[PDB]
Amino acid sequence: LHIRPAPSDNLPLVDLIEHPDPIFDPKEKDLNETLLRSLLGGHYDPGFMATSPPRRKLQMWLWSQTFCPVLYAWNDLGSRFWPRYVKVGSCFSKRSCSVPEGMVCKPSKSVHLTVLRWRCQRCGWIPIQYPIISECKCSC
Amino acid sequence: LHIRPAPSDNLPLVDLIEHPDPIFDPKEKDLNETLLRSLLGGHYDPGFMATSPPRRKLQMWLWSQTFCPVLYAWNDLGSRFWPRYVKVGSCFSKRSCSVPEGMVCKPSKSVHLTVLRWRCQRCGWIPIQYPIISECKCSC
Amino acid sequence: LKSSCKRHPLYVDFSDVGWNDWIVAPPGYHAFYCHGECPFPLADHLNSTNHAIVQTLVNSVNSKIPKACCVPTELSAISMLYLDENEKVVLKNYQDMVVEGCGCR
Amino acid sequence: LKSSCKRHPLYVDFSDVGWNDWIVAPPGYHAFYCHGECPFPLADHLNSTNHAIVQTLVNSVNSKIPKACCVPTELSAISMLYLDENEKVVLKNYQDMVVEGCGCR
């Protein structure tokens, strides 16, 4: 039952907290991009990653995809992630997407990317799922 | 500051609670419709009362008034009120009023009617404001 | 009263609180109230927030941190006849007046 | 601690609660917690519901009725790296984790 907290499918993702420390941080030797790129391999998505810093339900869908497009902005994830830079998506909650004005653009469908994570107790890289946005819904 | 509870402009109106009792109830003699009608007088609104049981902001308005009309249903107020029957309004929260579907019809503007109320400590009729609905907004 | 978090009865008589001078009707209503313990663990039948869960575990390891509190998690409104600031006796709705459900926060 | 309803500090270390077996990161976070008295009257600076106001007055006339409780009235979320049911280490958001404000309920 209530053994532990319950997660949430809300996006985008709140920045993960981290107190850095050359110990909770990789150490160069274990940073060989050649060997890193191989450990990720097919999971590397160049369209969203960078080594260095750069019935009627159909009508709702076609509509939202027109007025609620996903906006992407490169985001730095820190040193404990590889790749270090990930293009993150967000919805355009500026002007109202409906008529009469009232609704706004909200995420409706996510997509899981796989990237490397540096974890310690001793220490090493591991793969994790990083969710990003692929569709925005015009909801309220 | 927080001396007492704070009211609310939300409509329609929750039925007022009352434990009846021939004592908290008028007594015929003080029921002469001839004298009652005179005590109310100009406040009597026949369109809503019955002696016996029967820029862009403009666009939002014209729209809501078209798809969010006020629906009226006669409502019995009991014996401690005069007149006893009052046409109450409500919004059509059945089908969605916006596109893409998401918003619904919600009240946006009220109107105060004046009717008689039988109150005791000794006992007599008094006038009170009874709010009704006159406009519905297509909001969410 | 060591039972778990649940709703308890409670009728409020306005004249007993000195509100009959501005509230014309009703003479009072059933407001209820929440009470009971928020224990470790929080059973399935308990409405609780992630923080209440987190805080409850902390209380199990450190008694210095208090347990989550049993408060209303669902309320309803009531209409009231009363005299306003302008000296007119009005009839309006009052939200968050009647406790409908209890939970741990 | 007889102060009024306010937010207090509280860092939760997952390993101290036995959560470091499923939570990969972070090692813990600042959850805070609410505490303090909800007195009569409830000052301007106190977020309170109509029922809390009603219940507070009842407590002033009848000590058998408890005062309103000081609980979180505003919370925020945090992301967490953890292992899911399918054995995949996922990164998701967790709502109602950090107490942002306190009030009387």
Author numbering:
A (entry chain A), B (entry chain A): 31 to 84, 142 to 208, 214 to 232
C (entry chain B), D (entry chain B): 10 to 114
From the reporting publication:
pmcBone morphogenetic proteins (BMPs) are multifunctional cytokines belonging to the transforming growth factor-β (TGF-β) superfamily. BMP signaling occurs through binding to and subsequent oligomerization of two type I and two type II serine-threonine kinase receptors in the cell membrane, to form a heterohexameric complex. Finally, both Smad-dependent and Smad-independent signaling pathways are upregulated and downregulated by various cellular effectors, such as coreceptors and secreted antagonists. Thus, the former are membrane-bound proteins, known as auxiliary accessory receptors or coreceptors, which fine-tune signaling by promoting or inhibiting the interaction of BMP ligands to their authentic receptors, whereas the latter (e.g., Noggin and Gremlin) bind to BMP receptor recognition sites, hence physically preventing binding.
